[PDB]
Design a protein around this ligand. Structure first.
Ligand SMILES: Cc1cn([C@H]2C[C@H](N=[N+]=[N-])[C@@H](COP(=O)(O)O)O2)c(=O)[nH]c1=O
Ligand SMILES: Cc1cn([C@H]2C[C@H](N=[N+]=[N-])[C@@H](COP(=O)(O)O)O2)c(=O)[nH]c1=O
Lengths: 204, 204
């Protein structure tokens, strides 16, 4: 059938980018690697500013919508590649979008408001949340990181309770690159082997 | 009390801009003129490139979000000016954002989805819709405007059912600058007198 959309979510420095590259290289040549935010586009450009320069002041709602817009500008290419039989591994997506913004506790910006902009976007066939027991960019402070992990758990737990079986939480506490690799593969392989119709897609 | 938020909506070439400038000169010195989209900012610049150059390709969902983000990056200063007693004349706001986008008929982008990103925004104290019974920018085509007109009507008609009385539909057909001005004023003057508490606002 069509390729699979695999997502790996988690806190900055949990081994996310590494396991993504590892999974990507192991799925060649019919696999593409996608990173969010996608900083090479014009919208991704303002997102890069915001994250690397605090003089660039932008309200919480504005930057939030830019992050969702950034996914919407690329989504059509994703759907296309999947149809051409290629697999796609993503480093962050909708879940990071909601969590990092909701952890701020800004008036009006709760979990539900935060998701809305992303409603209609392609939903991953499988989402892996890597969890455990710098400072260059805006959200890089131990105190904030603790809050987003709290929100992440709140969000995912809600979705799983609601019946979403495509979400799997992997505890990578004190485990090596290859042990974590084996854990992830133990989960992804069986989904790569299931046949999915070209016409079947899930959306947020 | 606080200054009042006055909004004038409508189709391109309905006299909307000239009326806003007339009202502004009439409320000055204690008044500010604000136009959306505000193409002065970085996000506004992206909006501008999309509207002035059809070479610039961007998904409907992505541009829609940039339009909302453009409002969200200015709203704090709007609120601030009202608290200091200054009145604000606004040329286009969230109604244009929902109408011009839902008119496209793109799958998933209905009146509902289109409104979500603007939820939580300061609702204007008075909304005047200029109704009637160029070509160097995107959207500026006779066939599209017809769709936008019918979209505005369905939207505004909806808000009326819900109980919003701040929306007034002013028919400007075959009328001159001065006559329309008189109509606008007969609706604006009352509101400008009505006492509004320093901290009372309506939101979307
Ligand atoms: C994709 C995405 C990431 N982010 C943040 C997470 C990251 N914050 N930190 N630390 C930041 C940069 O991400 P990367 O380090 O993964 O490039 O963007 C959001 O706020 N929303 C989103 O939609
Ligand atoms: C403020 C705003 C304007 N628009 C469109 C309306 C106008 N369309 N045409 N033709 C366009 C530019 O309007 P102005 O000429 O008033 O600058 O922006 C939206 O699509 N959504 C919005 O949120």
């Amino acid at each position: 059938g069509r390729g699979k959309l695999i997502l790996i979510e988690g806190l900055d420095r949990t081994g996310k980018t590494t396991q993504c590259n590892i999974l990507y290289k192991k799925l060649q040549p019919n696999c593409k690697l996608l990173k969010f935010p996608e900083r090479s586009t014009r919208i991704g450009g303002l997102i890069n500013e915001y994250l690397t320069d605090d003089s660039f002041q932008l309200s919480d709602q504005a930057i939030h919508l830019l992050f969702s817009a950034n996914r919407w500008e690329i989504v059509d290419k994703i759907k296309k590649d999947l149809l051409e039989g290629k697999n796609i591994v993503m480093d962050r997506y909708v879940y990071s979008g909601v969590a990092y913004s909701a952890a701020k506790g800004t008036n009006g910006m709760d979990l539900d408001w935060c998701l809305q902009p992303d409603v209609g976007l392609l939903k991953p066939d499988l989402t892996l949340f890597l969890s455990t027991q710098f400072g260059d960019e805006r959200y890089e402070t131990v105190k904030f990181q603790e809050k987003v992990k709290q929100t992440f758990m709140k969000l995912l737990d809600k979705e799983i309770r609601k019946g979403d079986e495509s979400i799997t939480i992997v505890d990578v506490t004190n485990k090596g690159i290859q042990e974590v690799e084996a854990l992830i593969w133990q989960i992804v392989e069986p989904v790569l082997s299931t046949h999915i119709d070209h016409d079947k897609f899930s959306f947020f």
